[PDB]
């Protein structure tokens, strides 16, 4: 695992020793090389995980997330360099350093064998994101957004720390292998109920769960493009990964402790899909769609079936890629017209046809068109829910209908109709933007040929 971590660390002195006009080129090239190297972790053994050492291990769940992070870094660099052109060399190097530190913390988080190290890195991811949002955000609400993002996370995460140290004291270990092999049932008691809550609420708020999701629109809208990319693509999946790791020791309590969370997730996915229908800001719609998809992931994790975990893993990967692509698409238009209002710029298909094609493909993947992996995950989760209870199909179908509705609503509003007359500064699409959209979309379609790479350990 050091063969991935050490080059990521080497990215720091390499970008701090580069010339003022070569930082983007060097960082992009070596980030792509690191992603290529990290692609070798997909070879999984089946029966058990790849245990490199006492500190790190790789699973069929961790490997797609690691590859997604390593692949997302170069796309973040490509998206960032346009709006940072006027910045000084030192501040651009600091921004790239923030991105590299975030990547390092993420790659170490997904491979830790022990839960305290996972917690330490999972909290350490906060600082670079907070710095990025509050320093390179564009509006004045970035400060309030950063405060929300920090405190919503910490209020859930601190009880997790207390629960983890208590569990290590009572059991003697927190190593995930020992945790799994020496699992014992949780009795029906108030102490066990509060232990369950302390082990669950941090990952709940990172998803986010409906009712604890208010930080996400603020943080995702007010962050720069790279910050939004990493928030939607990767940082939302930390909660799901933590849930999959932690629910091993929570049985059989989850059988009834999951009822309020399932109810909240289903009704709130309906609510957020409905909210997307009346939104004046283009980024907030994407944020709320992310909330709905993560609510579906929460249901999948809560029901505790192999098909549910497979669908949840597929949906996490697909949602990460699709949300990153949608955020980049919105950012291109924002850079054109310097406003996030959806109806300001209309009929962009007449002026930008290839970008309209990218918009159409992203909208089609957002509504989970077959045989894309988005629908693979969603269908697996829906089938698992149907096995859990036949009445879930009503809510699943309603959510599907509303998702198609607002996806095509966004597409029609932004791309169709007639152009706004007074707006006359819409230049032809750059090679960088088209390449960024292609690099987002092509892995999505290529993953359809080999769906088992992202289905997870339960495959």
């Amino acid at each position: 695992m050091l063969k991935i971590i050490i080059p990521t660390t080497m990215l720091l002195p390499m970008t701090w020793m580069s010339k003022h006009n070569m930082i983007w080129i060097n960082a992009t090239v070596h980030s792509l090389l690191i992603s290529l190297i990290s692609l070798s972790l997909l070879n999984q053994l089946g029966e058990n995980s790849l245990n490199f050492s006492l500190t790190f291990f790789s699973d069929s769940l961790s490997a797609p997330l690691l590859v997604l992070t390593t692949w997302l870094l170069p796309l973040m660099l490509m998206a960032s360099q346009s709006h940072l052109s006027k910045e000084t060399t030192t501040r651009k190097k600091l921004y790239i350093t923030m991105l590299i530190l975030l990547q390092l913390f993420l790659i170490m988080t997904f491979t830790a064998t022990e839960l305290i190290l996972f917690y330490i890195l999972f909290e350490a991811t906060l600082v670079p994101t907070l710095i990025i949002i509050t320093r390179w955000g564009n509006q004045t609400e970035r400060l309030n957004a950063g405060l929300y993002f920090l405190f919503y996370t910490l209020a859930g995460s601190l009880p997790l720390l207390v629960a983890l140290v208590y569990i290590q004291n009572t059991t003697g270990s927190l190593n995930f292998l020992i945790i799994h092999y020496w699992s014992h049932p949780l009795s029906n008691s108030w102490s066990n109920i509060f232990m369950w809550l302390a082990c669950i609420m941090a990952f709940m708020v990172k998803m986010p769960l409906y009712g604890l999701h208010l930080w996400l629109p603020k943080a995702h809208v007010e962050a720069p493009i790279a910050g939004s990319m990493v928030l939607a693509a990767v940082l939302l999946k930390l909660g799901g990964y933590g849930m999959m790791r932690i629910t091993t020791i929570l049985n059989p309590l989850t059988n009834y402790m999951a009822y309020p969370f399932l109810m909240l997730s289903m009704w709130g996915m309906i609510m957020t899909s409905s909210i997307c229908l009346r939104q004046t800001d283009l980024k907030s719609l994407i944020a709320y769609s992310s909330v709905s998809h993560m609510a579906l992931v929460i249901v999948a994790i809560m029901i505790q079936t192999p098909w549910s975990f497979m669908g949840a893993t597929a949906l996490m990967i697909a949602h990460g890629l699709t949300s990153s692509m949608l955020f980049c698409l919105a950012n291109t238009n924002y850079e054109r017209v310097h406003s996030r209002t959806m109806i300001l710029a209309r009929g962009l298909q007449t002026l930008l046809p290839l970008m309209a094609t990218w918009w159409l493909v992203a909208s089609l993947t957002n509504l989970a068109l077959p045989p894309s992996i988005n629908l693979i995950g969603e269908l697996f989760i829906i089938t698992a829910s149907f096995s859990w209870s036949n009445i879930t199909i009503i809510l699943m179908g309603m959510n599907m209908m509303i998702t198609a509705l607002y996806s095509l609503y966004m597409l029609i509003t932004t791309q169709r109709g007639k152009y706004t007359h007074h707006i006359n500064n819409i230049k032809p699409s750059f090679t960088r933007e088209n390449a960024l959209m292609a690099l987002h979309i092509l892995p999505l379609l290529l993953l359809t040929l080999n769906p088992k790479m992202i289905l997870g350990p339960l495959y």
Binding site: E47, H180, Y181, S183
Partner: protein, 175 residues
């Protein structure tokens, strides 16, 4: 062909009738079949013959890996991590093998249904009962274990079923 075992994947003797023309009109399907043969099946056969000639000059082998039988989870003490790990690996391997067995039986059922045509409801009863037996066994073995399954949970499910069956048998003995 002979590539796959014909006992695992059996099929009926494939009875086919002989053509018995009743009219002097020429059959267009036969002429089209001859054209297709002469224009497609011969060049493809020649290309395959050349490919096999090239393959014969380079012959190498790959082997099926054999796994020893290690003690299962029933004969591991409570906190012996190594025996537990090896038993769990063996149990997972057996789970995969059982899944593949059910897959083979399902393939047999599907092939029977397609082959028998309009008489599938009568001529596929044996495949149906085979699938019923294997499905019941696989369900009893592995159903309701949920995610995070293990050999210990399978053993607990088996022991619960055994206790229920023993109680039922004992109460029937007094009847």
């Amino acid at each position: 062909p002979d590539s796959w075992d014909k006992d695992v994947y059996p099929e009926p003797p494939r009875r086919t009738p002989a053509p018995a023309p009743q009219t002097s009109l020429p059959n267009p399907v036969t002429y089209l079949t001859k054209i297709f043969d002469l224009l497609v099946d011969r060049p493809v056969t020649l290309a395959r013959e050349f490919i096999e000639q090239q393959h014969a000059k380079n012959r190498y082998y790959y082997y099926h890996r054999e796994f020893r039988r290690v003690p299962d989870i029933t004969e591991c003490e409570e906190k012996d991590i190594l025996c537990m790990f090896e038993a769990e690996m063996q149990w997972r391997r057996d789970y995969k093998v059982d899944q593949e067995i059910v897959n083979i039986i399902q393939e047999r059922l599907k092939a029977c249904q397609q082959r028998e045509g309009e008489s599938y409801r009568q001529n596929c009863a044996k495949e149906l009962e085979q699938f019923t037996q294997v499905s019941k066994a696989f369900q009893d073995r592995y159903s309701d274990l949920g995610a995070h399954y293990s050999a210990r949970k399978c053993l607990a499910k088996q022991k619960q079923r055994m206790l229920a069956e023993r109680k039922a048998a004992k109460e029937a003995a007094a009847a």
